[PDB]
Amino acid sequence: TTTVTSEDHFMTFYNENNKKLIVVDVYPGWSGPCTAMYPTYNQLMISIDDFEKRIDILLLDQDKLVTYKNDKFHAPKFLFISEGKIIDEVLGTNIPVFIEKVNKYIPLS
Amino acid sequence: IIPLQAEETQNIKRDLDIFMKEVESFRKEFMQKSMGYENINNAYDTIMVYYHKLTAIEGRALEYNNLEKLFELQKSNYKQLKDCMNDLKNLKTMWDAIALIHFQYNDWKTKPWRQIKADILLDTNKTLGTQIKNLPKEIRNFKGYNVIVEKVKNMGTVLPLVSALHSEFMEDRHWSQLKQITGTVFDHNSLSFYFEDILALNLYKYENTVNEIVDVAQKEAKIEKKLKNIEQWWS
């Protein structure tokens, strides 16, 4: 996974993982988000990079890159980058149990 | 002139399609569990080969369009190229599934170093559920999936064998009797890195004997615990 700090950082991390998918996580579901974001990032990175690989996650901390990716797409914020370009955007805040269901769905092409 | 050139191009295209089918199949055949990075690199190389085939396929379609004449054979050739692309897409999906399985295998290796009987029992139950879900999700795709699929079953069996050890009922003597049959140097509680040691004895091959013992131990403590009552009361 790529950790990002900008919509510019989000997009860079997506472009740098062109073969698979780079998911930019902009902000999180509150509630002491930073430490929780890093902890989820570690489990998602093993599910993202190790287990499914398919996907590296880059926890946007904390700007509006998600909104920028959505604006670019025309198609918490989750912006999926393929070869650095937004291809799939979803918004909402989810708990860890919800994330496990998302891992089963992964990995998208 | 178009058919003579077309026969030569078609032979070259068939050779390229066979090579592309072999490249995706080799990546699918390779199994991480354990192996990492090289398998991912092979998948990236296969995608590049597919991209080259797509450019060649685009050229054949353009040549057919230039030739025109409502030729059924030209349309059929494009369809054959599309079928090869679909097979390549299936191979790419198989590679992604293998990477997810490899990540789960890596987590299991980390768990063995971490060890902990209480932690292992919780980890084994979670691992068994995730492995079962992954096997059900996989369907269709390409042939030889079952050969890789079987591995998942082996991993599940290994996870199950580990769960039996998670029992704290067994003592050192009980473990030793089981150890003699097992032949494993590692004891019931030997190290933090003991979980990795457990993996060598196959779960499928050795849950049976582990189970017999796990049961014996659980049986013995029911009595031992009884004696604790007689002991404590009368003493």
* Best residue in B96, B105, B135 for a mutation probing chain A (most A CBs within 10 Å): B96
Asked whether the beta carbons of residue B99 and residue A54 sit closer than 8 angstroms, the reply is yes
Asked whether the beta carbons of residue B103 and residue A109 sit closer than 8 angstroms, the reply is no
Q: What helix, strand, coil percent values describe chain A, rounded to 5?
A: 45, 25, 35
Question: With 0-12 CB in 10 A as exposed, 13-18 as middle and 19+ as buried, what is B83?
Answer: exposed
Method: cryo-EM
CA dist., res. A44 & res. A55, Å (int): 9
| Cis-peptide into A107, omega within 30 deg | yes
The residues, ordered by sequence, that sit 6+ positions from B22 with a Cβ below 8 Å of its Cβ are none
Is A68 in contact with A10 (CB distance < 8 Å)? yes
CA dist., res. A106 & res. A56, Å (int): 11
CA dist., res. A5 & res. A26, Å (int): 9
What are the strands, taking DSSP E only, across B79-218? none
Tokens of A34: 């930073």
Please note each residue after which chain B is broken, C-to-N distance over 2.5 A, or write none: 33
Closest C-alpha to A87, from A27, A26, A24: A24
Question: With 0-12 CB in 10 A as exposed, 13-18 as middle and 19+ as buried, what is A26?
Answer: buried
CA dist., res. B60 & res. B78, Å (int): 8
**Which neighbouring-strand residues pair with A91?**
A77
CA dist., res. A40 & res. B139, Å (int): 30
Tell how far CA B48 is from the center of its chain: 24
Question: Other CB atoms closer than 10 Å to residue B87's CB: what's the count?
Answer: 16
The residues, ordered by sequence, that sit 6+ positions from A95 with a Cβ below 8 Å of its Cβ are A29
Helix (H) or strand (E) holding B211: helix B203-234
Indicate the residue of A53, A106, A109 with minimum beta-carbon distance to B40.
A53
The crossing angle, in degrees rounded to 10, of helices B72-114 and B145-165 is 10
Asked whether the beta carbons of residue B101 and residue A47 sit closer than 8 angstroms, the reply is no
Q: What helix, strand, coil percent values describe chain B, rounded to 5?
A: 80, 0, 20
Q: For chain A, say whether B90 makes contact (Cβ under 8 Å).
A: no
